[PDB]
Structures are given as C-alpha cells and as structure tokens.
C-alpha cells in the first residue's frame, strides 16, 4: 500500500476535523471539507476573517482527524503537520487541467497541509499504516 | 432550551474529536468516547501512558467537536475549555447511585471538561445556541 491510495481514501472521507492554535496557543477544532488529498498533501478551504483563517495564518501547526463509515469499512486517518495558504499559481502545478479539480481555482482561500506525518487505520480489518507527507509503513 | 438538554444531545453523540497540546504546544486530535455529559461537564476516559493522557496531564486546555447524523437531524457541538482528571470521590457526587452510570467508577482514568464555552448547531433547522460550562443563548 502507498500514499496515493491512503490519500485517495482520505479524499473520499470528504470532511475532517481540523485543530489549530490561536495567538495564546489555545486549541480550536472544527469540521472542514477536504477539497482534495494526494501525494502533495491535504487541501481545504476557509474564508478570510474567520478564526480558522486567522489561526492558520498566525500559526501553521495543524492536526486533522477524519473518519469514514462509508461502505463496510471503518477508516480513520490522523495527520499532524503544517499548513500554508496556496494560490492558483501553485494549484495549477498540482491539479493542472484535470476536470474533477477545476473548482479549486479562485472569497475563499485554499490551504494545504504540505508536510507532516500520519496514521491510517482500518478498524474492522486491524490494518494500521503510518506515513509522511512532503514513505508508508505497515505496522 | 437549556444546558441539560444540550448536554443530553451531546452525550447521545457518543463520540467526539478531542484536541489537546503537547509540551511544545503542538496540536493533537483524536476520537474518544463521551462517557457522559451534563450540567457538570463532559466526561471521557483514557489510559495512562497514552499521549492523550500525557497531554491532558501536562496542559488542561482542550477543544472538542462532536457531530450526530443520528435520526433526521444534523447536530454539531463545539466546546473549548479545560479538562482535569477526576476520581470516584468526585464522580459519586455527580452520578451517585444512577444505574446507567455505575460503569464510570474505576486501568482507565476519567477526565472532565469542567469549564468552557460551547456552540450547539442543528444545521438542518438553522438553530444556533451558545452556552458555558462550570447560561445558554439562542443566536
Ligand atoms: Cl464543526
Ligand atoms: Cl481518531
């Protein structure tokens, strides 16, 4: 199993809980849509003038957990890493002309978890994988 | 609407994502079972020698989000506050002889979000409430 596949699974989860820090280091956590997820990282959006946006802009550190009980599997992904805002200039090199992903080009602001380490767990099958972003190991 | 009711809803969500801090202030987030939730706070368990446990013991600051798509409602609760370990001595004053909650008395360690502020949102009905723990307002 490889990262392309883990990230495809994550992308299909559609939604994750993202934990970020304010200027006092206090934790905050909310659901956000996973716009895309692949070998390059995890992409999501938020709006300027939201606290999620402020927090990410003030401190790149992020943790995310996502879970799917879609189909007959129960799948959990946990990631800890760093997020940055990204513009179309960068997105084009990742998504290019692919029609499934044209919506990502700009209102909203896209961010990317560009570096980190993660854990993928299929609970019903007892399969655990650890991986990095920005290198997958079956435990 | 009052806190007893919000917390009953939360308790029925069964599971939340809890975000905590390590000694470097880095965020971490995982699912944990909501053992109980009421006017006194939100109770959950973890084991010694887990990172969740270490983190909570090192820094009380916690954020939690929980979501239910049980029934026809879509319900989101977000809480930011502080958690502490609690022993049976304390739990008895909260749960007493109530048979539904005897399992809470001790292996595991119970914690309590004893203070904080929260947001309850029924997305399909457009109803938003803010509240505190340790005082509910319809927005
Ligand atoms: Cl949320
Ligand atoms: Cl988890």
Residue B92: domain span = 2-139
- For B62, the closest chain A residue by CA position comes to A27
Measuring CA to CA, which residue among B82, B137, B89, B92 is closest to residue B112?
Answer: B82
- Written as six digits, the tokens of A43 are 């992409």
Residue numbers in A near B76 (CB within 8 A): 31
Among B26, B61, B62, beta carbon nearest to A61: B26
Measuring CA to CA, which residue among B17, B25, B94, B114 is closest to residue A60?
Answer: B25
Residue partners of A118: CB distance under 8 A and separation at least 6: A6, A77, A78, A79, A80, A81, A130, A131, A132, A133
- Written as six digits, the tokens of B56 are 């909570």
Residue B71 per-residue DSSP state: T
Residue numbers in A near B23 (CB within 8 A): none
Residue B4's CB is within 10 A of a number of other CB atoms, namely 11
CATH number, domain of A113, equals 2.30.110.10
Nearest ligand (C-alpha, residue B16) = 2
Q: Given in angstroms, what resolution was this structure solved at?
A: 2.0
Using an 8 Å CB-CB cutoff, list residues of chain A that contact chain B.
17, 19-21, 25-31, 61-65, 67, 76, 78, 80
Distance of CA B92 to the CA centre of its chain: 18
Cα separation of A57 and A87, whole Å?
14
Using an 8 Å CB-CB cutoff, list residues of chain B that contact chain A.
17, 19-21, 25-31, 61-65, 67, 76, 78, 80
Cα separation of B99 and A91, whole Å?
56
Query: B111 forms bridges with which residues in the sheet?
Result: B44, B85
Q: Which helix (H) or strand (E) holds B12?
A: helix B3-13
Complete DSSP assignment for B16-67: EEEEEE-TT--EEEEEEEEEEEETTEEEEEE-TTSHHHHHHHH--EEEEEEE
- For residue B92, the SS3 value is helix
Please give, rounded to a whole number of angstroms, the shortest distance from the CA of B20 to a CA of chain A: 7
- Contact between B63 and A19 under an 8 Å Cβ cutoff? The reply is yes
Query: B76 forms bridges with which residues in the sheet?
Result: B67, B121
Q: How was this structure determined?
A: X-ray
- Contact between A12 and B21 under an 8 Å Cβ cutoff? The reply is no
Cα end-to-end span (Å), chain B? 12
Query: B91 forms bridges with which residues in the sheet?
Result: none
Residue B72 per-residue DSSP state: T
**Count of structural domains within chain A:** 1
Cα separation of A1 and A51, whole Å?
37
Q: Between chains, do B26 and A80 touch, taking CB under 8 Å as contact?
A: yes
- Contact between A32 and A42 under an 8 Å Cβ cutoff? The reply is no
SS3 sequence of chain A: CCHHHHHHHHHHHCEEEEEEECCCCCEEEEEEEEEEEECCEEEEEECCCCHHHHHHHHCCEEEEEEEECCCCCCEEEEEEEEEEEECHHHHHHHHCCCHHHHHHCCCCEEEEEEEEEEEEEECCCCEEEEEEECCEEEC
Distance A15 CA to ligand 1 centre (A): 10
Residue B122 burial (10 A CB sphere; 0-12, 13-18, 19+) = middle
């Amino acid at each position: 199993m490889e990262l392309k596949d883990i990230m495809h699974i994550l992308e299909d989860m559609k939604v994750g809980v993202f934990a970020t820090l304010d200027e006092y280091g206090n934790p905050h956590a909310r659901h956000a849509h996973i716009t895309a997820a692949n070998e390059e990282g995890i992409f999501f959006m938020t709006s300027p003038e939201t606290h999620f946006y402020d927090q990410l802009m003030g401190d790149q550190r992020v943790a995310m957990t996502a879970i799917s009980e879609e189909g007959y599997l129960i799948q959990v992904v946990r990631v800890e890493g760093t997020a940055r805002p990204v513009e179309n200039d960068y997105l084009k090199t990742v998504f290019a002309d692919n029609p499934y992903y044209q919506h990502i080009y700009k209102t909203m602001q896209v961010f990317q978890i560009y570096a980190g380490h993660g854990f993928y767990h299929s609970l019903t099958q007892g399969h655990k994988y650890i991986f990095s972003i920005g290198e997958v190991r079956a435990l």
